[PDB]
């Protein structure tokens, strides 16, 4: 398992998401 | 205006929220 920061881990748990930096990157990814 | 924390203000500016 890869190493993930605490905020990333909490978001992945509560939202329900490790695959993935800017504001426009989120818009393109989504 | 109402006081808004730094993360809240940055998100509103960089995502178009009031």
């Amino acid at each position, epitope marked *: 398992e890869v190493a*993930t*920061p*605490h*905020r*990333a881990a909490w978001l992945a748990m509560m939202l329900g998401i490790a695959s993935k*930096i*800017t*504001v*426009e990157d*989120v818009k393109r990814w989504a | *205006e109402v*006081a*808004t*924390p*730094h*993360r809240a*203000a*940055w*998100l509103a*500016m*960089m995502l*178009g929220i009031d």
Partner: antibody
Amino acid sequence: VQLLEQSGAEVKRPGASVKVSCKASGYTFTSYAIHWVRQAPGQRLEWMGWINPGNGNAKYSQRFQGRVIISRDTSATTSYMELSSLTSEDTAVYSCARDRGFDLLTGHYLGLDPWGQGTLVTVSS
Amino acid sequence: ELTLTQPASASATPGQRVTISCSGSSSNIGGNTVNWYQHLPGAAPKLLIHNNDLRPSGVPDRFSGSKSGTSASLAVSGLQSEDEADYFCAAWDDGLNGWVFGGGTKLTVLG
């Protein structure tokens, strides 16, 4: 290289207006907010306002509402700041800074970086 | 209003450790992060510390940041002559809805 090139020095009379430019290069202009600050000689830095180069939304300090307009030019990747009704108290070095924002993975704030070289605006009759 | 308080000047001999204080309130430092900048004469501000302790790559490990509540401090270990400059802290203030800055500190390396 992430560089913010800022316009040359200005000398203007009280009651006039000055427009200072900040040309960005070396990164994506539309993906990082731009801040305008000023420092009068021998005084504390004073935050003026900040704009989203993509959205164009701009917000200003209460000390400068109705007197300053911050604008964008995405084609030239240049942020503009015009201050009107200039007084001798408006004599200062005007600086632009890139807002690196928040890392969404770590929640960290990456700081204001880089900075413009500054623009000395002198106001006197 | 709500501003950042920072000592006017600080000084120490080369090779020593010097600390620069930055005091605020719950609106700016207590609720947000403190950022530290080096301001050489004739040069643009240089980011030394972001997120209260993180230093960017290229900033030497001599510069270290600490935060406790509404106060924060910058520490420079092993002073070199090139460290003589102006240092100011920066933080977002919620009431002002914008950045507030310290008055700066003139760090003098005694020669």
